[PDB]
Amino acid sequence: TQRIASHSHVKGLGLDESGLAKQAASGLVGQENAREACGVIVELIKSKKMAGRAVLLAGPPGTGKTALALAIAQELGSKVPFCPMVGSEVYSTEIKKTEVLMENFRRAIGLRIKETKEVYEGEVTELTPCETENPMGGYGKTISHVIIGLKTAKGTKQLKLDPSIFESLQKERVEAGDVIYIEANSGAVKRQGRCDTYATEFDLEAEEYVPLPKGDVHKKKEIIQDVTLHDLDVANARPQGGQDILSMMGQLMKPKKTEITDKLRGEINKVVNKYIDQGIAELVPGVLFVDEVHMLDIECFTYLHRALESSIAPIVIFASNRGNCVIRGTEDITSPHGIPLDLLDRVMIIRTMLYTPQEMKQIIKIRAQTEGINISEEALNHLGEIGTKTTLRYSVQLLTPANLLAKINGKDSIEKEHVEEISELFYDAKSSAKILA
Amino acid sequence: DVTRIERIGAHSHIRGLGLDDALEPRQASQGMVGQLAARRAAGVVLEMIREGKIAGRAVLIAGQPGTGKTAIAMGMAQALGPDTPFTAIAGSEIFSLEMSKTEALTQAFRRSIGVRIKEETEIIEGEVVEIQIDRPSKVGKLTLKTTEMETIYDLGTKMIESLTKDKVQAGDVITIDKATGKISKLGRSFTRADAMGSQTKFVQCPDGELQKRKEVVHTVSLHEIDVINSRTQGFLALFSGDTGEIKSEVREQINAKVAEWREEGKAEIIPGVLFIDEVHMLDIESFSFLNRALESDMAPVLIMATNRGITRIRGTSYQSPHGIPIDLLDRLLIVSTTPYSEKDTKQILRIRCEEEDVEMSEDAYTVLTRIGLETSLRYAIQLITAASLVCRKRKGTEVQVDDIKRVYSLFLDESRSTQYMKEYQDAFLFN
Amino acid sequence: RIERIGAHSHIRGLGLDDALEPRQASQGMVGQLAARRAAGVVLEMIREGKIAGRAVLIAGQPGTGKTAIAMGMAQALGPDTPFTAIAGSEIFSLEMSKTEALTQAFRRSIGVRIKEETEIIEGEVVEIQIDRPSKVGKLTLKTTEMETIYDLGTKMIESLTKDKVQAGDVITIDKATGKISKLGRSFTRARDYDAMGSQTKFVQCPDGELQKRKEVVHTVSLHEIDVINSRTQGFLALFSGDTGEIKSEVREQINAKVAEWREEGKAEIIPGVLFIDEVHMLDIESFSFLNRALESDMAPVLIMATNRGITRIRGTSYQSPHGIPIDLLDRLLIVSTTPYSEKDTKQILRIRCEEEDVEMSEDAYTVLTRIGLETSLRYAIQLITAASLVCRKRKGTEVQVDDIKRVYSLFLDESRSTQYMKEYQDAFLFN
Amino acid sequence: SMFDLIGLENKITRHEAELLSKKKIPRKLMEEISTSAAPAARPAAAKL
Amino acid sequence: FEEWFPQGRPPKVPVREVCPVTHRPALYRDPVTDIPYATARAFKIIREAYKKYITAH
Amino acid sequence: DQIYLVNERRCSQAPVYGRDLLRICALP
Ligand SMILES: Nc1ncnc2c1ncn2[C@@H]1O[C@H](COP(=O)(O)OP(=O)(O)OP(O)(O)=S)[C@@H](O)[C@H]1O
Ligand SMILES: Nc1ncnc2c1ncn2[C@@H]1O[C@H](COP(=O)(O)OP(=O)(O)OP(O)(O)=S)[C@@H](O)[C@H]1O
Ligand SMILES: Nc1ncnc2c1ncn2[C@@H]1O[C@H](COP(=O)(O)OP(=O)(O)OP(O)(O)=S)[C@@H](O)[C@H]1O
């Protein structure tokens, strides 16, 4: 059913309770030192204490840098915001690169808003005013309460409201037999419709007959929604504004991405702090994964300097396979990973190593199991030798074409002949480059 | 006889990928001859696409110019057939003033994943016989009629307002959506068509049940959903193309909602193929994005074609095998095309002449095959039609070697034009 | 909570005495005696707000604490004086020109203090009667000292009806606009009804007269006034940053009216500080604009930080001291930060440990200060947290030398990563 | 107007279009309709 | 007071109508002879019965 | 016949997307 991506086997970091990486566990093999460092980083993130800490994953391509980052994501779970991003994403036609970077920074800070709504729900059995000879003198018709009888499937309750609720009772077309919601706090009546018991099959009006509320009259309990700080920034930057001239004119114009000001983000910070102080909100800071960080230019790294030093920043994981590369945006400034030395100064470098043939064999077997491929031991050995010759990705990718060839042949296993034929049909970078030369 | 919008193109004769059910390429089938190994590889990749299990698998078609890479791509598209998205773009199409190269690649990817959404509607259709006085809070009756039934409906205020706003009149066919109470007038009665005629359209009365359950399957792409959700009237961007950098949050929400629908059985995801012809025209930024866009669970199968040798990657000073960074080359499988022998060129020319509907003598075929081997395949293909026209001007039924020589002298190939230029190069501007 | 332990969280100020002399370790601020003293002098100059358009550059080797000095200056300056911190890369927008972005940054750093005399009536509502068929009404409010019965006009009745005032509400009413603001529910009436309602929390009854005049101070920035006065609903651009190239004449009008307000006792100008971190990211055009933006009387104090030395000026091939053109360098004063000694490094590490709440042994401090001198201060500061986490995993309470060595082995610095890379240089791309 | 595809978005759905294509008054019935007299046989209300 | 508190007027749950032919829940009502019905067969049977009734009466 | 031909035209054209498709593809 589910589609198998290149990282669908990575389920975690495969560390024992002591913090040590098993030889192979939870889809990862080898790279033990890097997985242990990533476990330390997972604990740092779970501590929710440090802001704007950066780790660079550095190593040759195919050494599991993205595998390790996605393992970190799996270890943190779905509740922690994991924002993946490529360095090419900063070059927007609408907003500046700094704005893209800051927006992605605000997408890694999560917020759990817990709001408890208290409502009185039911079908209106009676609307009777309570009359009194109460007033501070006066020969008029006085009421001190409005009796509303609300009927749910569970039972019936008679509510006695402020007499001022009579205005909204007929402002809303509330009669007996109508389904209503009476905000416990707001005290605003709200006619959902009419009860579906008073609904013949010969009635054409629709969106008027709502089922009788289930359960008790008095309940709406807590609604919990998870947002990012960027969601709040975007929402408060341009209001929905669907009620007036804003509606037609703004919708008619294209909604471009804007360069949100620091004023708005500071106000959002203040509001979120007040929400957390009131207990309505919980802050779950996440991790921002910048893959191909070498695609960022010098301006982007210079901004990252300031973005990583803010108390509100997430944890940032940089991946870079560049050996000694000219920094984008500079003509002849080479720094180790295409990253300026002053950005590497405020980073912690986790280095990934080339896999030995046995580790490649284990990875290939794990990938075969993930893809639902039965592979003979001889085929596995030959594919490991191919990967030793060419690369891990190439050998990993022969699995599904070879399985298809075996299926076409009537087999349900990958044998040496199938992998040999697929190796002959498809070329790797080395052989193609030899052909080109 | 009649000309359609589609006519004889470069690849119009490639009806599919000519390989057995064992994926063994026949020497000449479905308008494609030769390139046996590359056609077998294309069949394997096509089976991958049809299974739709593995996400973001990248295939590169490499080889010399005129070796059939776009022919193989069009054959794959023709074997795949409609209703499986095959998006074909050039690497140049991603450089837009509307949106970033990253955004353009994202849209191309979202356009190669197809979604089939089914819904139940439960509508009422019938010819209206009567709508009576609502003057009282208004209350009225509606009489609807099929060829087998008629019923009378008691109208609430909202339905009365909808009916009076659409000016629904006795003797017209409406459909009412029960969930929404939405009135759609689709035609006028069959008692006239009897002196009328206007924007109106005439429909005969519905037969069967007034109230009908109905399953409609809607085919869209992820890009279409993205642009529909991008803004309130964003569906207009499907026409104008004025999409403008759809938000990432919208795309995550759409991915989650699509996953929900797939779990609910509401939606069916059909992953497709994105074909980028001339992928050497991409920047290193675009290749960097492709590295990661393929690692998504909703990524299609990416097919790219390039005739480059060992060239510098665009936007960089680095020499890479196919003008493509080596990190992306590890992420894909490379299909290489062998040049064409005399037999293969002759067969290709024969198929092209069949497409043109032009008859050529065997001596003419020998001469044109030799010309193509000397100059290029495409030049021979063009000489086909040129010699057909020269033969027709001569009032002949078969193209002779004389006509081929005539068109050869009339039209030059790159080498001969370069030579004539070179002996006159001081007359040409800038070298 | 949204403020976590940032890189400069320990910096509570410049740690200077009344003589502007730096105390060795004070306010989370170790060493940098001369640089801190210069920052204190600049801070005094900022507080006086007398001389306009003053530029200071903090120059030093990486990690010597220029940004820490700037953050300490911001903390000692206080929330009242504007302090805008930007990176030089932030002025490169697609919404506006670099000169426009720099003008906006300059005008964010100037604050306008507008004091207006309001007349509010604040009391506890002990009675409100509204008669409705024009509406009639009566309202009685009381402080601790007096009670008064107000006969309500139609506008005031409408305001009260919109704000739904009852007995027991503490409200303030603006005599000019009639705006109703309710501060809570009062001690006397307090509990309210015997209906559904909700929980309760009560405020005090106001004291003194109902009408108390009073003078309120409203603070804005010049940028806010520009944005509000530019676009007829340009106020929402103060959040979206959608103000494209505010007209120069609009700004001249703002300046003239602000000077007029100052002369007429309405406004008081609060000159702030603009902090351009990484000012070497500005190009020659931006520096040329900065030259003349500092000549205006509405120009803040400009703090710039850069670790460059003898570097190309962006947008030009010229070499200049700090990547800043010499004409702008003659406009500013240079504060040089000296590298750190062993004991300063150890003190800073102790302060960061205290900020992060990590106990570590003295042997750990020796080893970590040696590591910081050998590798860098920032790397050691990160080893702080890493080693605390390792110790907690070990289930210890004090970070020992063994944890420090463990995190040294797990996480590399630039030197060791560069060496290991040098060993496997062929495996990395585009060397 | 037959090449106005954008306008049709405001008007109908594809199920409605397929319905219309199946239900468009056939040519023969149009002449039958324009020949025959009005069949005004409404039985009038009964309320049984 | 009556304008603002009409109140009363009990909702009066409807009648669960049935089709005379198939004794199924009714979902249609014949405009002539408002007898409810559920199927088209029921409709033609009802109309035949009305024809015979009006012939008899 | 003119009525038939024009009504044929108007009854034969399908929308590219249609209201139902745009409505079902909306996020809540
Ligand atoms: N240690 C590992 N254990 C298991 N699978 C791995 C491991 N390392 C890599 N893989 C998988 O092998 C393939 C190659 O690894 P990738 O993570 O894609 O390469 P990469 O290093 O992440 O790419 P770059 O150059 O760092 S952006 C992917 O399918 C990974 O999920
Ligand atoms: N079996 C075949 N294989 C390849 N080309 C064929 C074949 N039959 C006909 N052709 C034609 O040969 C010409 C060669 O063009 P293609 O190679 O298919 O397209 P292309 O995009 O130019 O790819 P190149 O030239 O190899 S870079 C086209 O006009 C094809 O229609
Ligand atoms: N008095 C001080 N002066 C300077 N830096 C200090 C001082 N006290 C502590 N620090 C350290 O300064 C660090 C801030 O990052 P650093 O790069 O080391 O200095 P900086 O303030 O960022 O200036 P630059 O631009 O990096 S040289 C904090 O993590 C502290 O450990």
Side-chain angles (χ1 to χ4, degrees), chain C residues 137 150 152 159 215 221 272 297 380 391:
Chain C
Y150 290 110
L152 306 179
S159 202
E215 173 159 276
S221 69
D297 53 338
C391 160

Side-chain angles (χ1 to χ4, degrees), chain B residues 171-173 184-190 192-193 196-204, chain D residues 8 11-12 16-17 19-21 23-25, chain F residues 3-4 6-13:
Chain B
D172 58 19
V173 186
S184 295
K185 184 206 297 230
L186 54 70
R188 210 168 286 237
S189 189
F190 71 162
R192 292 180 274 285
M196 263 63 157
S198 175
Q199 185 269 35
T200 67
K201 51 187 83 86
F202 293 106
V203 177
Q204 88 200 6
Chain D
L8 297 169
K11 292 175 186 175
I12 57 184
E16 291 184 10
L19 217 166
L20 268 164
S21 95
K23 296 216 82 33
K24 45 195 178 50
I25 196 79
Chain F
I3 282 153
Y4 173 79
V6 72
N7 163 77
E8 269 280 284
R9 257 199 214 104
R10 269 181 287 213
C11 287
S12 92
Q13 219 353 79

Side-chain angles (χ1 to χ4, degrees), chain B residues 10-11 13-14 17 32-35 38-39 42 61-76 275 277 303 305-307 335-340 348 377-378:
Chain B
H11 305 307
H13 74 276
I14 281 136
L17 217 64
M32 176 135 33
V33 47
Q35 286 303 339
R39 282 156 71 203
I61 317 183
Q64 301 156 23
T67 54
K69 315 196 262 303
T70 310
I72 287 162
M74 269 57 240
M76 291 185 57
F275 179 51
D277 213 346
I303 306 182
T306 193
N307 51 11
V335 173
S336 202
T337 53
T338 58
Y340 291 112
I348 291 161
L377 184 59
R378 311 216 190 91

Side-chain angles (χ1 to χ4, degrees), chain A residues 2-3 66 92 205-206 254, chain B residues 98 157-158 245 292 297:
Chain A
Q2 182 69 333
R3 284 183 88 219
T66 318
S92 168
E205 184 142 323
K254 194 164 63 182
Chain B
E98 247 295 344
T157 36
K158 278 210 274 303
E245 297 222 339
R292 319 322 299 200
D297 193 19

